[PDB]
Design a protein around this ligand. Structure first.
Ligand SMILES: *[C@@H]1O[C@H](CO)[C@@H](O[C@@H]2O[C@H](CO)[C@@H](O)[C@H](O)[C@H]2NC(C)=O)[C@H](O[C@@H]2O[C@@H](C)[C@@H](O)[C@@H](O)[C@@H]2O)[C@H]1NC(C)=O
Ligand SMILES: *[C@@H]1O[C@H](CO)[C@@H](O[C@@H]2O[C@H](CO)[C@@H](O)[C@H](O)[C@H]2NC(C)=O)[C@H](O[C@@H]2O[C@@H](C)[C@@H](O)[C@@H](O)[C@@H]2O)[C@H]1NC(C)=O
Ligand SMILES: *[C@@H]1O[C@H](CO)[C@@H](O[C@@H]2O[C@H](CO)[C@@H](O)[C@H](O)[C@H]2NC(C)=O)[C@H](O[C@@H]2O[C@@H](C)[C@@H](O)[C@@H](O)[C@@H]2O)[C@H]1NC(C)=O
Ligand SMILES: *[C@@H]1O[C@H](CO)[C@@H](O[C@@H]2O[C@H](CO)[C@@H](O)[C@H](O)[C@H]2NC(C)=O)[C@H](O[C@@H]2O[C@@H](C)[C@@H](O)[C@@H](O)[C@@H]2O)[C@H]1NC(C)=O
Ligand code: A2G
Ligand code: A2G
Ligand code: CA
Ligand code: CA
Ligand code: MN
Ligand code: MN
Lengths: 237, 237
C-alpha cells in the first residue's frame, strides 16, 4: 500500500489532524505546537499534533517493512536569550492513541510512569544532563537520550526545511536540515529497525515543549511552529 | 590522523591539483572538468581533477576505517535541450595513480579493459541502457550501475550544493543535493564498506564527460563546473 498526505498550510479544525494539549492552529495558517500569547512564547507549555489516521509501517504476514519520506518546515523564535531557551520540537512515530507524555526535556513523548516505544527525530534547544552541546539534531529510539547527534546553528525566527527519509532495505534513517536564509546544511543518519521497535500500525506527528516550571525560569521558552508538512509511505508486502 | 583541504576558489596551475585530459581551470577561477570553447560545451570531452596527495581511508594495522565529509558546489549548464544532454559528473575515490577511463556513460572512471576499484557519487544526466530516468543521483561501487538511485530535477546553469558524508562506525554514505535558487532538497544514502573495496591509500576527486562520438550527436553535451570544494577525513590511528 501507498499512503500520503500534504499540507501547504493549516486551517482551524483540520479534520486530518489530532491536536493535543497546547497545540493549536493560528488564524494565519501556522501550526503552533506550544503556547504563545500576544506574540510571546510561554513557559510550562506542551503540545502535539498527530495525523488523524494510523499508518502501517510493517506487515507481520509478509514481514515487509515500509519505506517513507517526510518533509516539513518549522520555525523557532527565541525572544529571550538569557538564561536559556527550551526545549525544542520533534517529529515522531509511536503506537496509535497515545497521550502527551512528560514535558520539558522529554518533549511530550516520553512518559516514565508508563513508557511506550517510539522513533523520533529531535531538534533540541536545551541542554539536559544527558545532552551534548545544543542546539543539535538527534535520532531517538525509545528514549530521549539520542543514538546519534549532530550540532547545528539555529536561524532564530528563520525558516527551516527538513527532509526525513527511511529506506527499509538498508534500514537507514537519514535526516537533512536546511536554513535557506543562511544556506547552511546539516545532515545525520543512523540505522533503525522499525520492525524491531514499533507495532504494525502507528501514528506520525510532531511534539514540542517549553521550559518546565521546575527550572524556575520563565525565560526558558521559544516558539515551535510547523509551517508545512508532507508525508509518504510505501509498504510492498 | 585528520586531513583536510579547502578550495574556496581555483587558481591557474594549482599546485595541489592533478588535472587530466580536458580538465582545466578558467580565468575566472572555476574548475571546468569538460571542454567548453567560446562559452559553448563540446561533445567528445572527458576530464578529471584529483587532489594531488593521497589520503588514507583505512589502516591495516589497526583495522580502523576513516570517516570523512566533503562539500562542493557545481553547475551544469545545458545549452541544447534536444535531443539529450550528457553525460554528467561524479565525485569519486580510487587507488592512487590511475588513468582516465572510458568516457561517455562511464564518466571517465570506468575502464572495461583494466578495471580498478572505486566508490563514486554520480550526477547522471544521460540515460544509458543500465540507467533509470534521468537526471539522478547515484551511489556507485566498482561499477557505473548504481546500487541506489534517486531522481532530481536540475537547475539548468544554476548552482548546486552537495554534501557527502561517510560515517565509518555505521558504514553509511549519505549524500545531499541542494539547489539554493529553487530551494529543492534531494537525499540518498547507502551502506558501503570502504575497507572491503578500496586500498589503504586513495585519491579523491571529480570526473565528468560529455556525449560520446558513437552516439552521433554533437548536441549531447553540457558543462561540468566545480565552483568550490572542501574535504576532511578522520582516521583514528
Ligand atoms: C528574561 O528576559 C528579559 C527580557 O529579555 C530580561 O530583561 C531584559 O534584560 C536586559 C539585560 O539584562 C535589559 O537590557 C532589558 O531592559 C530587559 N528587558 C525587560 C524590559 O525586562 C531578563 O533579565 C533580567 O531582568 C532584568 C530587568 C534585569 O534585572 C536583569 O539583570 C535580569 O537578568 C531575563 N531574566 C533572566 C532570568 O535572565
Ligand atoms: C503548568 O500548566 C498546568 C496546566 O497546563 C498548570 O496546572 C493547571 O492549573 C490550573 C489552575 O489554574 C488547573 O485548572 C488545571 O487543572 C491544572 N492542570 C493540571 C492537571 O496540572 C500548572 O500549575 C497549575 O496552575 C497554577 C496557577 C497553580 O494553581 C498550580 O497549583 C497548578 O498546578 C502550570 N505550572 C505552573 C508552575 O504554573
Ligand atoms: C574526439 O576527440 C579525440 C581526441 O581525444 C579525437 O581523436 C584524435 O586523436 C588523435 C590521437 O589520439 C589526435 O592526433 C587527433 O588530433 C584527435 N582528433 C583530431 C584530428 O583533432 C577525435 O577525432 C576523430 O578521430 C581522430 C582519430 C581523427 O580521425 C579525427 O579527424 C576525428 O575527428 C574526436 N572525435 C570526433 C568524432 O570528433
Ligand atoms: C541541436 O541543438 C540546436 C540548438 O539548440 C538545435 O537547433 C535549433 O533548433 C530549433 C528548433 O528545435 C530552431 O528553432 C533553431 O533555429 C535551431 N538553432 C540552430 C543553432 O540551428 C538542433 O535542432 C535541430 O537541428 C537544427 C539545425 C534545426 O534543423 C532544428 O529544426 C532541428 O530540430 C538540435 N538538434 C536536434 C537533434 O534537435
Ligand atoms: C527533566 C526536565 O524536564 N528538565 C527541564 C529542562 O528540560 C528545561 O525545561 C529546564 C528549563 O529551565 O527545566 C528543567 O531542567
Ligand atoms: C556507453 C556510452 O558511452 N554511451 C554514450 C552515452 O553515454 C552518451 O554519451 C550518448 C550521447 O549521444 O552516446 C552514447 O550512447
Ligand atoms: Ca534537551
Ligand atoms: Ca548515464
Ligand atoms: Mn538531545
Ligand atoms: Mn546512472
Amino acid at each position: 500500500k501507498t499512503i500520503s498526505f500534504n499540507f501547504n498550510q493549516f486551517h482551524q479544525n483540520e479534520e486530518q489532524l489530532k491536536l493535543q494539549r497546547d497545540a493549536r492552529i493560528s488564524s494565519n495558517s501556522v501550526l503552533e505546537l506550544t503556547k504563545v500569547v500576544n506574540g510571546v512564547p510561554t513557559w510550562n507549555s506542551t503540545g502535539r499534533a498527530l495525523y488523524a489516521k494510523p499508518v502501517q509501517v510493517w506487515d507481520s504476514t509478509t514481514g515487509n517493512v515500509a519505506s517513507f519520506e517526510t518533509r516539513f518546515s518549522f520555525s523557532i523564535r527565541q525572544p529571550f536569550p538569557r538564561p536559556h531557551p527550551a526545549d525544542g520540537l520533534v517529529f515522531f512515530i509511536a503506537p496509535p492513541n497515545t497521550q502527551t507524555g512528560e514535558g520539558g526535556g522529554y518533549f511530550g513523548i516520553y512518559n516514565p510512569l508508563s513508557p511506550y516505544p517510539f522513533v523520533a527525530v529531535e531538534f533540541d534547544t536545551f541542554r539536559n544532563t544527558w545532552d551534548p552541546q545544543i542546539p543539535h539534531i538527534g535520532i531517538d529510539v525509545n528514549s530521549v537520550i539520542s543514538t546519534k547527534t549532530v550540532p547545528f546553528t539555529l536561524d532564530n525566527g528563520g525558516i527551516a526545511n527538513v527532509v526525513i527519509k527511511y529506506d527499509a532495505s538498508t534500514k537507514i534513517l537519514h535526516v537533512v536540515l536546511v536554513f535557506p536564509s543562511l544556506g547552511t546544511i546539516y545532515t545525520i543518519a543512523d540505522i533503525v529497525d522499525l520492525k524491531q521497535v514499533l507495532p504494525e500500525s502507528v501514528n506520525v506527528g510532531f511534539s514540542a515543549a517549553t521550559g518546565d516550571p521546575s527550572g524556575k525560569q520563565r525565560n526558558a521558552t521559544e516558539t515551535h511552529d510547523i509551517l508545512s508538512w508532507s508525508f509518504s509511505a510505501s509498504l510492498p508486502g
